[PDB]
Each structure stands twice: as structure tokens, then as C-alpha cells.
DNA sequence: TTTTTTT
């Protein structure tokens, strides 16, 4: 009697506010029109509703308190009232012991996604002689949210001797999945390994988190299992009842700001919030974040479009301090420092008896940024795999389990020291690094940074760092992903005449100073005008972008 | 120890015979002739010592 | 339809989706095949062959066109294409030894020649392998599946 | 004294934050007992890691543990215990280049990355390293050119803060004083008078520890604007000093 | 199927 009173009361409240009613109206009308277009020319949305915690507070604090205190009594009847209405219409650190048996909002990182298996709920069985169907359900502790008597064996020959032929199609199924979320590592105490728990999803939310993202989670803390009173520490935990959580004036501001001619320089100086000089270096980070164009050839292979730069310089020129700026400003990047053994270029498959995979560092940074620190200090083992990652954009893993082949087209930035000391221009331009020769042609830009001692520069470094101890960034990444979907460019005739003369300069006179001169350099000549056109959001390719690229080659090398 | 090597193995001759054999296979007629082997010698004298320019 | 599906192909498979009965309520699925439509029709299974071969012969300047036709996506390297055509030919064979109709030409030089032709060889002719991607058991022993191999 | 307190900590709009704790080097001639000094440094700070060399019986340094339930898990190390503390490294030249890179980064950007078979995180390390080296051939390293000490390069020292050279000059009064001062340390507890000194100065070591705990989180130090122009004019003089010793030589 | 060694 209690259940129907809670049902009718919440139904009255849901009937009290019609704001959600027109939402369900749009749900039903849209699914109707979607099935209407699918059944007229040729000859999706679920039923769960976001309920704000707005009106529940202005109606009954008793009922409010009941939801956030004992949710195992009010969410099922409220959904029951909703389904009736649908039919009438047609921190982990302080999480244990207390902050328990309630609805908990959890934040953290998506990691180690498990496997997808479906689960049966409603059985359909046909009897031969009676010529009738039947009905039988089964429940487990994930689905009921209430401690009910479990009813597990698949039925046959129930009452008279009629063959209970089971049927399908009409028999229902629901998928199932469990994932782990550890809290954010910067939030941790003085110095420790972060500790974690897990949350189980349901049917329409299977495979929404891949290992490696930033996710807010809202759900209910559910504890199952016989805690050692079965036959020594039990009562293992998990979380259920879940949701997934990762302007026109603003976009008009974007279109309005982009109507200028020197914002590349303005954004260039913008990306130096604490570093003096290195103007064209910031210009190159803008062009890397632009990402270039992708032109897959006719029945051939794709051509890589992003740009990768490794640095070398005197050990005091923000070599490592330029990296975290690129870390925070871009999107979906992972920083690798020092060693990278067993998991940068591979997945290793160490995981019922089966073989599973965990996406490695190079794979997880797909369509993103790879931050590599101390490239010469990397052991010689993975150096072979770096050529494959950087040139064919694929990773083939052939271990004893299953040989596979996949895609990762990541952007990579590295930072290395000279071989010994500061002799970066003293000995010879060649092999001040003692890197393999193919890696020279593999990387796009190679910066040589000196530590030239002067005085105007000395005073300017002084007041910059000194006032440091005593237009903006969020506008920029929005400007980036907006510039991604409609500013894709196309090459023009004017793009040819400059880079041809430029490649002639690369072979007739550039070889007299340094090396190498590859056709890949000419590909970068196309990519820079492309990225300049993406930053200016142009559609064509202009001669002026190539004029900029000539200075970019001179500043990067000569 | 100049650009040219010291000795010529008989496998060089075995290879050039099989090469001219494949050259005859591209004629699809079993018409092993003077130019058939001459092309086999051309890719040997041109394959090696192409470092003149 | 058994013994009719080679591994590593492109095929249209039709069927019905049924689970299999076995932590207590875990349903492992499978598919029962109903129809096979294979993309990339297998060769060797003469009329349509000579329909283009006789026209290819009577086309004039066939020898330069054949080697010019294998991987024309680069510039120059005409004799290189000649060597690639001759590698594609091969095909040669009492109380002694037979003859191996295989060619083994090595390539030295750098750098813009470098994988552009190397992957193209297996394109025209092919499993592409690297140094570390294959172990000592890779290029040459596992637990036997469902069907000590 | 300056190492046990720790400087400022900047949380700028800049994508990085800077570093606060400092570093101590003691390269020099043997017999100095700089060893006893580094042991007592470990005893004073509340959390700190003292290491004597590159080769242990049992003391490790990003831990990789693969095993029950066939699960990979992260155990620990040494910089992890000393996040926000003191690291003491003895035998700076007797050390290998096997995980030295983690130390070549832990003191400068506070960011340890792991991209192995188990995990793929970027963690924190707020440490401070204290060195105690020995040049080759002892006191003769200063008789040849004044460099000739680290065989790899000088960039590690550029990534340190303070470099001290301990010399050994005979002064008979200083020698007699260091003699009888140490005999008084061993026997007859003459230097050990300390209790009246406790009555007059520095009543305890544990007192100093409780004081540092109180000192670190309470004050929010920052420099003063009238003092900044002094340092700006001084960095010029040091860089000029290096110009004088470098360009003409 | 991956971590500490040494010729
Ligand atoms: N132009 C600059 N403007 C501001 N800060 C700077 C500048 N150049 C250097 N820095 C300083 O860069 C320091 C950190 O330098 P790093 O690049 O980490 O030294 P490092 O030894 O090269 O680092 P690694 O990773 O060990 S190579 C910080 O204290 C910054 O203040
Ligand atoms: N005032 C003192 N000066 C020097 N040594 C002293 C003094 N008082 C006691 N000692 C002892 O004398 C030893 C001298 O060696 P150290 O001073 O440790 O030399 P060292 O330079 O540390 O050599 P290391 O440890 O390999 S760098 C110390 O380890 C103490 O046992």
C-alpha cells in the first residue's frame, strides 16, 4: 500500500510540473517521426529522464531527504509512476562507511574498460499442444536495487507434460559492463599511490568510457555479496544507477574576431604567459595545434598531416617548461618522461581464460598530442618502434596471442639535450645529439637553442622573471575545435610557385650549410600553408602563408 | 679495393642465365635470342657502377 | 557451407544471432552463417584473359609499358621498375639439383625512395614485417584452439 | 638552515607551477665527515630519505610490481616517500645511469611519467635532493684546471642550486683546536656544558622539528618590491663575472 | 608472459 502511495504522490508531482512532460512529448514525437521517415522513403532514444534536483527541493523536503538518504524506496516507484505516465500518454578517499548507501557523485579518470557481455531477463516459451506462449523472468543483484529472492534453471516441462519450447526475438536482453575509476592524481595527499573503486553501468550506457579520459560520475553506491558469512574480509563494493558526464554570441565573437589580419601574432604572443622571446616557436605550436589537412590518395595510402617537433638547446631555455603549456592547452594528451618500456608502442595483452588488450601510450593519444621528455635518455629498445609509429601511422602487435593491426595518427613533441655540455654549434652541426640518421628525416622541425649572453636580453629576462614572482586561454581551445570543422582548406595554384622555388633553394644552397633535404620537407611546405589557412580559417591556400613558411624554415634551421 | 670487385663467381653467370630466362618469359614465346641475353647483361653493367654521376 | 571460408578476406556474412547456455548468468553469443558473398574473387578458378592479353600484345611498346605500369606513383627509377618486373616473373625449375626461380635483389641508398616502393612491392605482388614486431616464434608454438600445433 | 624551511610556491595562470625546496652539494676531499652531516640532516626533518650510494643491501628508488589474482599494481619507491621532503644521495660519482633520468627530472618539473605494461599515469614528486660527492684523486682535482670533476657534463650541476668545495689548509691553531675539540667530543664530555647551553640556547632538536611543521604551512612568503631591483642589478654582475673568466680564457 | 643481472 506504501508503494502505490509513493507512486501516486510522485506521479502527482510529476503531473504537477509539466515541464518534463513536454520533454517526453518531444521524445515520443521524435521517435515517432524517426520511425516515420524510416518507413516511408526506404521502401533510438531511450526512456530515462534527467530530473533536476530543482523542484524536488521546492516540493517536499521529506521526499528530498528520502531520495538522497534511502534511494532504494523512491527511485523504483518514481520510475513506475513515470512508466504509468508513459502508458497513460499513449571523493573515493572518504567514501567508505559513511557517504555510504546513498547516491554519490564521483569524479575521476576512465581506465581499464572491461568486456561487453549481454544478459537475459525475460524468457518466452511456447508450448506445442496448448499452442500458447509462456512467461518467466530472472533477477540478479545488479538489476533489482532491492534485496529480493533470486530465481535462477532454464525451464522445460512445467505443468502437464507440454513441451516448453523456448522462443527468441521476443525474449529480452540487456548488456552489462563494469569499469574502474581512480580519482584525479593531483588531488592526492602528500605523496601516495592513488586508490580506487568501480562503478557498473547498464544497457544504454555500455561502452561510453574508454581507458584514459576525464569523467564525472553520478550514481548509487551498491554493496553486494555474502560478506564472509558464506562458509576472510568480504563485502566487496560497486556503484549503480548511473549517468555519464565528461554560444551564439560566443561563436559570433569567434567569427568577428577572425575577421582580422594579425591574430596569428596576437595568439602567438598569447601562448607565452611566462616565457620571454621564442616568437616563432609559439607560431609553430599554433601550427601543430592546427593539425593540417589529410589527403588520402586514390587507391593508395593516407598521407600524414600533423607535424612533429623535437627540441635541442642549451639546458635553460624552457625546454621542459614549454611542454606543460602544450599539455594543458591542447586536448587529450599524455606526457611521457624518461623511459617508456613495454607499453608505449604496444599493448602487451597481459590480462576467464582469454587475451585482452590495453591501449598503449602511442595508441591512446590518437588525434592528440604526445609529450616526450628526454629522448636521448630513452633506452635503445623502443627506438626501433618509434620509426614505425611516426611514419606509417599504424601499430602492428604480433605476440603469441593474436597478431593485429590498428591506427594512431598522433602528434609528437620531444625534448633532448646535446651529447655533452653546451657545445651545440662549436663542434659540427651534425651529430651533436647522436641520434639515428632516419630520425632526422622523420622529425619536421629541429630547433637549436643557444644561451647567448647579452645585456638588453639580460635585463629583460630579469624583469620578466622578477615581476613573474609577483585573448585568454579558454577562448583559444574553443577557437580551435571550432576552427576544426569548417575551416578545412584546399590548395591553390599560388601555393605551387613559392614552394617550388623554395625546394630549389633547399637543394642548391641549404645543403651547403646543413642537412637533410627530403621530399617530406616539401610535404611540410604544403602542411604549413595548410595550418596557416586553418588558423586564419581561410578556405583557399594563399601565397602569404608560404611566405611565412619560408621564415619558419629559416628560423627553425638557419 | 677500387669500385670494382675482385672475382666473378659462377653464380653470377647462373643468375644472368635465369634473368635472361625470365626475359624470355616476358616474350611468352620461348624465343631465347641474342637480345634476350643482351638485356640481361645490360642490367648487370648498369646495375653496378651507377655511381658515376 | 563448411570448408569454404579462407582466413583474412572480405565477405558478406548473413545469419541469425543466437546465445549459448553456460558467474551464473553470462550469455556468450555467436552467429550461425546463412549466406556467403566473398569480395575479392580468387583467381585460377582463359577467354577473358586473352581478351585483354591479346590486346595488350597488339598495343605496341609492350615491354616498356609493362615495367612502366608496376607502381607508376613515383618519378624516375625506370631500371628499378625493370628489376621489379623481373622479380615479378621468377618461375623457373635428374639425380642432381633443380634451379630456383627466385630473385633476391638488395637495395642500398637513402632516403626518398624510403618505404614508398617497399610497401608498393607487396601491393603489386604479401605480409609486411619489421624487426621487433616479429619475435623468434613470429617469423618461423601455441596452445591449440577449439578444433600442440 | 635554509633547506629545512622551503621557499614560496607559485600557482600561476601559466600551465606550470614552480619549485620551492632547495638542493645541497658537498663535493670535496675525504675525511671531512660530511657524511655525519648528511645523517643528521635526515634526523632533523620530519620526512626525508637518506641514501648512501648507488648500491644497497635493501633500499630502492616508480615501482613496477606485476601477481596474486594476476593483477598489476603500483608499489612505491623512494622519491614517492620523500614528496615534499629531503633526499640525501651519497656517492654522486659512484652512480650508474639506469634510472638516473628519473632523478634528472624529479628535481625540476616535479612530474614522473609511467607508460608501462600496467599503468599509464603522470604522478607528483615534490622532493629536494642533497648531494655528497668525491672528485677523482681527492685534493689534486683543484691543482689542474678547476673543472675536470663530473665526467658526463655540467648540466646536472646547473640543475642544482648550491655547489660547495671543501678545501684542506693547515692552520696550527685551527689544527689544535680541531684536535682538542674532537678529543673533548669523545672523552670527558666537555663539548657535550650543553645542558647550560640548553638553558641558554636551542633547548631541543624535536623543538626545531615542531617549529618547522608550524612554519611551513602558516607563512606565505613573497619578496618585496624594493628588493627586486637589487637582484636584477646583481644577476648582471654574476653573468659579467662569468664573461670575464670565460671569454678572455 | 613480464623484472634483476654480466659476460
Ligand atoms: N625564458 C624563461 N622565462 C621564464 N622561465 C624560464 C625561462 N627560461 C627558463 N625558465 C625556467 O625554466 C625552469 C625550468 O627549466 P627546465 O627546462 O626544467 O630545466 P631543465 O634542466 O632543462 O629541465 P630538464 O627536464 O631536466 S632538461 C623554471 O625555473 C623556469 O623559471
Ligand atoms: N670534526 C670532524 N671532522 C671530520 N671527521 C670527523 C669529525 N668528527 C668526527 N669525524 C669522523 O671522521 C670521519 C671522517 O670521514 P668523513 O668526514 O665522512 O669523510 P668523507 O669525506 O665523508 O668521505 P666520504 O663519506 O666517502 S665523502 C667521519 O666519518 C666521522 O666518523
mmCIF file of C-alpha atoms and ligand atoms in Angstrom, chain D residues 29-36 132-134 178, ligand 2:
data_model
loop_
_atom_site.group_PDB
_atom_site.id
_atom_site.type_symbol
_atom_site.label_atom_id
_atom_site.label_comp_id
_atom_site.label_asym_id
_atom_site.label_seq_id
_atom_site.Cartn_x
_atom_site.Cartn_y
_atom_site.Cartn_z
ATOM 1 C CA UNK D 29 88.170 15.929 -0.132
ATOM 2 C CA UNK D 30 87.646 12.891 2.060
ATOM 3 C CA UNK D 31 87.730 12.818 5.808
ATOM 4 C CA UNK D 32 85.558 15.903 6.090
ATOM 5 C CA UNK D 33 82.728 13.960 7.872
ATOM 6 C CA UNK D 34 80.205 15.490 5.508
ATOM 7 C CA UNK D 35 78.694 12.025 5.937
ATOM 8 C CA UNK D 36 77.856 12.707 9.579
ATOM 9 C CA UNK D 132 77.823 14.442 -1.168
ATOM 10 C CA UNK D 133 80.433 13.718 -3.886
ATOM 11 C CA UNK D 134 84.163 12.953 -4.215
ATOM 12 C CA UNK D 178 90.015 20.829 15.846
HETATM 13 N N1 LIG F 2 85.014 17.232 13.071
HETATM 14 C C1 LIG F 2 85.197 16.154 12.310
HETATM 15 N N2 LIG F 2 85.754 16.317 11.091
HETATM 16 C C2 LIG F 2 85.949 15.244 10.327
HETATM 17 N N3 LIG F 2 85.679 13.967 10.598
HETATM 18 C C3 LIG F 2 85.122 13.829 11.814
HETATM 19 C C4 LIG F 2 84.860 14.849 12.708
HETATM 20 N N4 LIG F 2 84.284 14.343 13.866
HETATM 21 C C5 LIG F 2 84.243 13.052 13.654
HETATM 22 N N5 LIG F 2 84.635 12.679 12.397
HETATM 23 C C6 LIG F 2 84.730 11.287 11.936
HETATM 24 O O1 LIG F 2 85.732 11.175 10.944
HETATM 25 C C7 LIG F 2 85.171 10.577 9.756
HETATM 26 C C8 LIG F 2 85.781 11.256 8.559
HETATM 27 O O2 LIG F 2 85.179 10.881 7.316
HETATM 28 P P1 LIG F 2 84.150 11.781 6.557
HETATM 29 O O3 LIG F 2 84.236 13.103 7.269
HETATM 30 O O4 LIG F 2 82.836 11.017 6.385
HETATM 31 O O5 LIG F 2 84.852 11.825 5.187
HETATM 32 P P2 LIG F 2 84.081 11.772 3.858
HETATM 33 O O6 LIG F 2 84.567 12.975 3.177
HETATM 34 O O7 LIG F 2 82.600 11.700 4.215
HETATM 35 O O8 LIG F 2 84.310 10.509 2.992
HETATM 36 P P3 LIG F 2 83.020 10.118 2.253
HETATM 37 O O9 LIG F 2 81.914 9.801 3.280
HETATM 38 O O10 LIG F 2 83.225 8.840 1.423
HETATM 39 S S1 LIG F 2 82.532 11.628 1.119
HETATM 40 C C9 LIG F 2 83.678 10.794 9.896
HETATM 41 O O11 LIG F 2 83.006 9.833 9.098
HETATM 42 C C10 LIG F 2 83.469 10.611 11.386
HETATM 43 O O12 LIG F 2 83.418 9.230 11.713
#
